[PDB]
Write a protein that binds this ligand. Structure first.
Ligand SMILES: Nc1nc2c(ncn2[C@H]2CC[C@@H](COP(=O)(O)OP(=O)(O)OP(=O)(O)O)O2)c(=O)[nH]1
Ligand SMILES: CCN(C(=O)COc1nc(C)c(Br)c(C(F)(F)F)c1C#N)c1cccc(C)c1
Ligand SMILES: [Mg+2]
Length: 639
DNA sequence: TTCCAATGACAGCCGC
DNA sequence: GCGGCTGTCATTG
């Protein structure tokens, strides 16, 4: 039967619980948050509505130990157990002793780590296990887990416990989700039991699949690094953003007024229908789609398609970048600056990390706006600044996916190119546009980058035609030349597709499996799509494994030389100048740190050394380090 | 439906 | 009408 032991109701029961807890090598916790320094719990940073009122502990069976964190107001609180005494015993059981292997199971580890630090002033110091991450590791293409989906798949006999608990079918922790009529006590107690028992089953499945090493040494440590990043946030200038906005908005106004005079009437730039009516019916341009590729052809024939393309580019920077950044910005009173606090997302097909609310990975590259024949540089990245005195440090792998592909295909031609050869995208752009390397613009080098990765990951003649501006037949010849020049690669493509068809999956460098049952499908599209996913998942997934290992190994090093706080949050949660390096952003093959002026040399050495040593391949992992007063103004830095 | 991966704004439709 | 869904468009790696 489900039982909730209120450990704080009696001094004697409390000490028995504390003695037992201190013996445990494994337990689950769940935080109890409810809607309303207070007597009834700890406010949460970012919600004036919700309190941490307690937490539940489970170490077996259907017994939840509910540990109240309320001063006053289940049987009542034994008044000899002061809140200060409880917080002592809580910090004591949640921090490691020397040579003691201890694992805590937490649904949504990152959100719980942050609330414990910022709300209760407690820093977890044990090995962590999140059942959400274990689910991902067993099937990366599975839908994002909820407590309901985990219990459905791995603990189905306990589904009755979730009856009438509709919020269990949302992403957020049952304990953390105060948008329920059920008490935090009940929610946290149920969660603690479901998560402890679920994680036993998930651990057996990880062991069967041989993913337990990956889970404990890479994925959960990677989640800890991402928790520090989410506590850190990224510095933001609103002045820089506003001045860019005003230039962009002036260009949008001129574009609209010129578009409407060419069209003869107002039209919505957001309606494909309206644009199609104007381009194809009312001006009779030859094709009805209004995609980038269509308008890119037509801009040679009439000014309006080009105006449409520029309108969408600039509207994107204003409505999808400026508006969300200026809405999500938050004063940090300690650092004395505005910051943005994006949320990491690790549930991806290939093991990349992305961000939401907002997705800072999608902040535009620098681009140019001309008005009255005068150019203005729009660098949205220039709004992302370090704390006063600090620098942004970026360290990026040179052609990580190409180096991994060389290693796995042993392709002698690709190895030569990487070992000496200058920029491969410049070589492609030069041959293509009848030029020498030096003339290539940013936009053209990106077009050549798209062509090179496109061809490698199974792009067809029809599409390569559009990108290169040549006939399908010409593109098909170019594919043949590539396939002939790099045979190793082509053998590895066919050997990866053969092995996938047989097994129903592919594996990355660390052993993670992606299931591609489309590989057997009779439909030509679905089959070809799966074959392309098969090849791309191995290379892109392997690269994502290397960057995670690098991230984890850098964080260990930073914390040894750490005569200082491991995140900006660790100073908020604490309640003396800033020293060290703070993980602020991941960009797939690139890590950004915010670094104190004094420490930039040492942090740059650590970051480069650890990224170059992450794994041993047939080829050297080359790393470029850059540094600057903004993400937009980074300069090469020889380390 | 024929590079892969990702988030997110935004009209327009459809069963409730 | 209304929230859900579904492309379509954008951007980044
Ligand atoms: N399949 C595929 N992968 C891409 C594409 N663009 C980028 N990627 C992958 C492979 C490279 C990786 C990182 O992107 P970057 O622009 O940093 O690639 P890079 O080759 O390292 O470029 P750079 O040398 O300028 O850093 O992301 C694309 O269009 N298709
Ligand atoms: C196959 C002929 N060709 C090249 O070899 C260009 O250089 C490279 N192209 C590709 C797709 C790759 Br994958 C490479 C690689 F990086 F692998 F060596 C190169 C090179 N060098 C080429 C040159 C210009 C334009 C196009 C589409 C292809
Ligand atoms: Mg790169």
């Amino acid at each position: 039967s489900l039982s909730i032991i209120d450990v704080a109701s009696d001094q004697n029961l409390f000490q028995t619980f504390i003695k037992e807890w201190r013996c445990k090598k494994r337990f689950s916790i769940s935080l109890a948050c409810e809607k309303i320094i207070r007597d009834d719990g700890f406010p949460i940073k970012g919600c004036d509505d919700t309190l941490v009122v307690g937490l539940a502990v489970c170490w077996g069976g259907r017994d939840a130990y509910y540990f109240s964190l309320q001063k006053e107001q289940p049987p009542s609180l034994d008044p000899s157990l002061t809140l200060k005494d409880r917080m002592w015993y809580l910090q004591s059981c949640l921090r490691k002793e020397s040579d003691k292997e201890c694992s805590v199971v937490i649904y949504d580890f990152i959100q719980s780590y942050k609330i414990l630090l910022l709300s209760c002033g407690i820093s977890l110091e044990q090995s962590y296990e999140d059942p959400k991450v274990a689910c991902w590791l067993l099937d990366p293409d599975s839908q994002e887990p909820t407590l309901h989906s985990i219990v459905t798949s791995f603990l189905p006999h306990e589904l009755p416990l979730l009856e009438g608990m509709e919020t269990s079918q949302g992403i957020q922790s049952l304990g953390l989700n105060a948008g329920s009529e059920h008490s935090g006590r009940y929610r946290a107690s149920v969660e603690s039991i479901l998560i402890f028992n679920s994680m036993n089953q998930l651990n057996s499945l990880l062991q069967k699949e041989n993913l337990q090493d990956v889970f404990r040494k890479v994925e959960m440590p990677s989640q800890y690094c991402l928790a520090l990043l989410e506590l850190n946030g990224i510095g933001f200038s609103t002045a820089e953003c506003e001045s860019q906005k005003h230039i962009m908005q002036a260009k949008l106004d001129a574009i609209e007024t010129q578009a409407y005079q060419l069209a003869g009437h107002s039209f919505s730039f957001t309606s494909s229908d309206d644009i199609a009516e104007v381009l194809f019916l009312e001006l009779k341009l030859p094709p009805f789609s209004t995609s980038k590729d269509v308008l890119n052809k037509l801009k040679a024939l009439h000014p309006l398609p080009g105006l449409i393309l520029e309108w969408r580019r600039i509207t994107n920077a204003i409505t999808k970048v400026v508006f969300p950044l200026q809405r999500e910005k938050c004063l940090n009173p300690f650092l004395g600056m505005e910051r943005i606090y994006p949320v990491s997302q690790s549930h991806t097909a290939t093991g990349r990390i992305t961000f939401t609310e907002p997705n800072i990975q999608n902040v535009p590259r620098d681009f140019e706006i001309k008005m009255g024949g005068m150019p203005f540089s729009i660098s949205m990245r220039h709004a992302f600044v370090p704390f006063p005195g600090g620098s942004i440090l970026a360290a990026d792998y040179s052609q990580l996916e190409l180096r991994i592909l060389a290693h796995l295909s042993h392709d002698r031609r690709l190895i030569q190119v990487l070992n000496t050869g200058a920029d491969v995208f410049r070589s492609i752009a030069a041959e293509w546009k009848m030029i020498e390397p030096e003339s290539v613009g940013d936009d053209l080098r990106q077009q050549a980058k798209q062509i090179c990765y496109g061809i490698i990951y199974g792009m067809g003649a029809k599409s390569l035609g559009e990108q290169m501006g040549i006939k399908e037949n010409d593109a098909a010849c170019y594919i043949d030349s590539f396939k002939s020049r790099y045979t190793g690669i082509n053998q590895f493509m066919t050997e990866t597709v053969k092995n996938c068809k047989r097994d129903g999956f592919v594996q990355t460098i660390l052993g993670r499996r992606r299931y591609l049952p489309g590989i057997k499908d009779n439909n030509p599209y679905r089959k070809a799509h799966a074959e392309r996913q098969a090849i791309n998942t191995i290379v892109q997934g392997s690269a994502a494994d290397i960057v995670k290992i690098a991230t984890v190994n850098i964080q260990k090093q930073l914390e040894t030389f750490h005569s200082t706080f491991k995140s900006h949050g660790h100073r908020e949660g604490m309640l003396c100048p800033i020293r060290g390096g703070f993980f602020i952003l991941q960009l797939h093959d690139e890590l950004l740190y915010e670094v104190a002026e004094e420490d930039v040399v040492q942090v740059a050495q650590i970051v480069k050394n650890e990224m170059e040593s992450a794994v041993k391949l047939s080829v050297k992992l080359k790393v470029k380090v850059k540094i600057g007063a903004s993400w937009g103004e980074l300069k090469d830095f020889d380390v």
